[PDB]
Design a protein around this ligand. Structure first.
Ligand code: GSH
Ligand code: GSH
Lengths: 218, 218
């Protein structure tokens, strides 16, 4: 069983949880709850760059989010059928990571900044990102983004759609195809289970959570 | 011939120029010199996320640095022999990307915070990154980072070694294996040509350069 090392929260590890659950893979989590917990990991020489996420899988101690995701996607055949499909998949997911990065960092923005940031995110979501993905779905009219079959791109997108919903649920409003994809994916047996209460799925970070995580990683 | 769309500067396109030259692939560049040049790319629908880097290759208009790099690495056999070798490669390159991002963003730091940033980069270079890569070279005693064969990780690392040298040439002093890799990789025919004057290799951005790019993208 793959074991995920991270604090008890979303952070950068969430995408990995989504992908494994989607692939139908059982996994364990070992939560870091103190600077000393991180310290131990860091001293065992388990973290190549002395950072987490870190995942123990197939005899490896993989570090670096993209590295972990690529390995998992390939192993479970959610990374396309050829080099060109991987290109489309990577192009789509990097765009998703860019939008997710703005949202993921919103808390660190100073109170005078935040307002300006929020407007920006919303603006880019409606004029930049959602239009781009609605357009690929439109380009071929299939239920999946690439190769007419489930891939990590579909899973990342839907994960991103839920996050956006938490910000402002009206942003997806003028994008039917994205709405249809969200429903379809949320209904796949594996994802539906992951979406239910009590799953390893993590909640949005709250004041307390943010703070406590800042102590650990200092 | 692949065509790279970016401004005449290092920016985020440089790693891609490095990889292609190393693989011995001739390419063309179409420099963006104004907001109008960029505007024409957006209006052509050539930029999926209305951003560059963008590379025209094998019939596609690839965007997103990481997407482009992964495609090129596979095409020219610089991406390992299997899923696990790709995991090591991805892990090593992502760490490299993190250090690079810090150096890349240095010119954006306000004068009052620059010194602290510079200090952080130097410290992390010596206690975090260089030790990690030296350790892997030490682990197997081979000329290359992975599979005892040239790969994108070796090419990326050396480019990074040159950037570090521009900042502080004493930073690599306690890492002989990295020093040897730098010489070894720099002597490969394709890279030696790329390092020679008059090549597509780009210079450090001077005050003016930053200023102009700042205008183009806003
Ligand atoms: N680029 C890395 C970022 C990893 C990272 O910043 N991890 C933070 C927690 S979010 C950490 O471990 N910080 C402690 C440190 O930087 O020493 C990845 O995608 O996995
Ligand atoms: N994550 C993208 C970042 C691309 C990016 O920020 N491109 C800048 C030039 S450095 C741009 O085109 N900015 C114009 C804009 O954001 O509208 C990638 O690695 O390719």
């Amino acid at each position: 069983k793959p074991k995920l090392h991270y604090f008890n929260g979303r952070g950068r590890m969430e995408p990995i949880r989504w992908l494994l659950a989607a692939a139908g893979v059982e996994f364990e989590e070992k939560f870091i709850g103190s600077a000393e917990d991180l310290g131990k990991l860091r001293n065992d020489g388990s973290l190549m760059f002395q950072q987490v996420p870190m995942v123990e899988i197939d005899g490896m101690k993989l570090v670096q989010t993209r590295a972990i995701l690529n390995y998992i996607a390939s192993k479970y055949n959610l990374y396309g059928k050829d080099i060109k499909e991987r290109a489309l998949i990577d192009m789509y997911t990097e765009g998703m990571a860019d939008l997710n990065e703005m949202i993921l960092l919103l808390p660190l923005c100073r109170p005078e900044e935040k307002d300006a940031k929020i407007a920006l995110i919303k603006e880019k979501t409606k004029s930049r990102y959602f239009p781009a993905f609605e357009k690929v779905l439109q380009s071929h009219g299939q239920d999946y983004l690439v190769g007419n079959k489930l891939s990590r791109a579909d899973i990342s997108l839907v994960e991103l759609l839920y996050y956006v919903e938490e910000l402002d649920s009206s942003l997806i409003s003028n994008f039917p195809l994205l709405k249809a994809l969200k429903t379809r994916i949320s209904n796949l047996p594996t994802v539906k289970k992951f979406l239910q209460p009590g799953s390893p799925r993590k909640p949005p970070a709250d004041a307390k959570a943010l703070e406590e995580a800042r102590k650990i990683f200092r």
